[PDB]
Symmetry: D2
Subunit: 296 residues, 4 copies
């Protein structure tokens, strides 16, 4: 039968019991990093990549809290839809849950607990999303590559293997929780078998693209900060890091209102209304300052 843009997914489900009891009353991706909820950072990340149709995947328990926080996205020039993940059966599951949302479009997956910062981050995202076929991932040098998907490179910089949490990592380059995919991903994810843990592995997805000669791995250099939210200690460092940048600059990191404003998905009048309910705190005052300041 005859036939004739990129959608975003934020996976913000269960971190199981790993951070209990801190996370007994709410999901991790609603905990604040400094002044804003965690999910603002990966959300702003998708927005920075130019993505406006976004699916937020969470637990059944917490979907209402995400919905209360973010609405349908139309205040920030977005359309946000919602899906639930009954059981934390792995990251690749986002594509089965997100199958009808994705449709026949390209996609991007971002972990709902991943924080990024740096210069020309916009352009780094822009190059990944412009690649219309294949998958694109980012490799970041870390102290503890054993905890991550690890990329092995040959002498000419070419990616030649991927291993999920190897005990003896071939390099210190970890695959970050930000992923760009073409229209082949749903089918790749549908045919995965659970790993020995009992999860549908994103690293198997990425390996399938690697075996087709269609995985781009770009370096996210050391001049970027890819922050750890894995532990209570790392969470605290993430808050301190953002607080230090924000107090130094009088500018915010991953303020979604700002990113919409600079993308011109919202205008001055719209942003002025969003500042009204928050006028008596620093966040609404910050939104108001953005209306009459040129920031390069």
């Amino acid at each position: 039968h005859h036939h004739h843009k990129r959608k975003g997914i934020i996976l913000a489900g269960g971190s199981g019991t790993r951070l209990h009891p801190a996370t007994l009353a709410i999901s991790k991706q609603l905990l604040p990093v400094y002044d804003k909820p965690m999910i603002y950072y990966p959300l702003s990340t998708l927005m920075l990549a130019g993505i406006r149709e976004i699916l937020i995947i969470s637990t059944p328990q917490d979907t209402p809290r995400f919905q209360q926080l973010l609405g349908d996205g139309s205040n920030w020039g977005l359309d946000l839809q919602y899906a639930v993940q009954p059981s934390p059966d792995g990251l690749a599951q986002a594509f089965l849950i997100g199958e009808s949302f994705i449709g026949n479009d390209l996609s991007a997956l971002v972990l709902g607990d991943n924080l990024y910062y740096g210069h020309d981050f916009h352009e780094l995202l822009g190059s990944a999303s412009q690649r219309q076929t294949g998958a694109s991932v980012f490799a970041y040098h870390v102290l503890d590559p054993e905890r991550y998907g690890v990329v092995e490179f040959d002498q000419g910089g070419k990616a030649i293997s991927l291993e999920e949490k190897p005990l003896e990592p071939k390099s210190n380059y970890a695959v970050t929780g930000l992923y760009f995919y073409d229209q082949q991903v749903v089918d790749i994810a549908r045919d995965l078998k659970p790993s020995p843990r009992g999860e549908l592995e994103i690293t198997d997805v990425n390996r399938a693209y690697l075996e087709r000669g269609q995985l781009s791995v770009e370096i996210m250099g050391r001049g970027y900060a890819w922050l750890d939210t894995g532990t209570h200690d790392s969470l605290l460092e993430a808050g301190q890091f953002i607080a230090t940048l924000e107090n130094r600059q009088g500018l915010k990191v991953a303020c979604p209102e700002e990113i919409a404003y600079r993308q011109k998905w919202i205008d001055a009048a719209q942003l002025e209304k969003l500042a009204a309910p928050l006028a008596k705190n620093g966040y609404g005052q910050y939104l108001k300052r953005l209306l009459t300041e040129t920031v390069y």
Copy 2:
């Protein structure tokens, strides 16, 4: 016998958007939910029957977190504050819970630390008549109830958020009352800023010579949770203590255990669901380590 209340109500829009999705006192300070700290404080004071007051939206979540308390040897109840009309409203909402008993109120977002905290709370809770509060030296007393002392160290006035504070001594968020507080609370009128003021309660006792203001010395940490920057500093402070010591601040299960409100067997069971993380490992280690 003394009953406890934790007022863990709404902090307006002051910390939005971080508190949009959920109330402050369910956010963590480092490894545990903020409310673990004031709950632990009441438990250290020997108080086992405790009323938790939160917004109507968040009461299910406090309930889900803490249950009826029986697993930690407590008897928890729950009640709602529909609107943030002032801290003294705790005694009106809590009137039937209190009954004819002595009471203590702690604010749901106040963190305490220090040597002999147990005996400081115990000397306040043993005082069967009158009211006991604590005064603590702060940088910014305008934000609090401010105690003025005469040259003999005797408290002579209390002012709520004065524009010109008389000293740097702030009343902490921890209050012990006798059987008169309910009746004093019932007679309160709203202040200029629309609230039933805990400070007017304390002023009623001060006017009868019945307010014991004890100094919480500079060797105690009373931590600030009122701003994003201070919520952060507190996490860092707790983390530095717990990583130095291999011991936890305000772990309710440990406090129950050392009060002997639960025995070894029950603590073992509590450590089971969390066995794979540090928090349950910590509980397990408490069974066979002597900590002075």
Copy 3:
């Protein structure tokens, strides 16, 4: 009468390159030089005659920083440790300074904080015979002198950096001795790792039943300065206390002032050269504020 020693000697190459240019105990923890903290500790213990031992390179700089002590009502002297041959060498270098008197040793990079620290030090310094030390629960006891206690709480062994620690109780860097320590130090032989061990001194008193090990409870902060990460945590801990309180930890001038070793007029003069910064402003405010 009891004399003090601060051992502020070399920490090898362990923290290089940060300590290449200058010794650790002249680096700041937040607003003040590390040594202000242990010096303040000795002063809180009532000790006014104090010997500062540093490397030969850095003694001029300790001298330049602190002078003879007379401006703060102290009597400071100085001596050198040519090589880091162990903490017990303090008593050999310090032999003639000590004379026939009681002594206390504090390590130059140890930070203490807590309620009733004054009375904890005072009960140790009042014990005119034997030796008093403090045991503190830590995560990593292998790094320290480790106390083992029997079931009655009585100390029964000390091991320096054991591979298999018997408890989590570390001996802190703060030691009170009677008139026997010099003679015990003189008889020490170097350990396998080439040092005159403070732990062998304490073991000599333990074998005579003369070692008082008191618990420094979990409500005290004994902060770690041994790593870059811990030096940082300490700055953050001090900063959080001082910014919350508008009061300083281990300001020597305040301690002198409250001991009444200097009077109002002398404190005023001390606040003059620093008047344009917070540290001198702080000193000036101490003249006309009552702090309990």
Copy 4:
């Protein structure tokens, strides 16, 4: 009479009494930021700009400590010379003190207490130093522009005024403590008169270049961190910021040995020797890892 590259200056003199008593025993620029002395960061910054001949200006009291720390630079492929600043008479004084060092060459001034971090920092420095005439400065958005030299821009992005610590800043763009100059600077600095404070102002120097149509002002964007070392509080945040980046990555910020190595001012054998004396700590172990790791 007939005639026929860029030198660096680090100003690391007195911060007066402002941080006393912390700075009573040593100068500020020898205090560590996390694991390394402060002066390593601006030094590495000059090295990143490709500058190998560098003059360190300090107090007479502390010149030996700087010399003990850094030597003559030949271990790191540099030549380091030393000068003293008897009295803290302003930043522009570096050019009178440095006059014979500079000679007839181009120059760069960096404050000895300035910390920078970000992606493509190398390329940002490269563009400033390639400009062979005029001066080049960097403008950075900050919360407290009143404390700094402030750049005013017109509607087309063009710099039109500079004011030193204005009470009512025309923008939030502060001039950073990193400056590139052509051969005119010594003469400009010689003819300055002290300000009402009694200092030779770097902002007057920069204004003189602006009045000649020869000041380039480039934006150092918000994706860079220009950290504050002005206060005990900011110092502590600077240490936390570096510690968080370093523990996350297993890579160092402004390790001078590394920068020399990557510039190829030193070779593998030379770097191996520099690791020998530090082998039992993390810093020497880090130098050793750099010998057999490819880091992009």
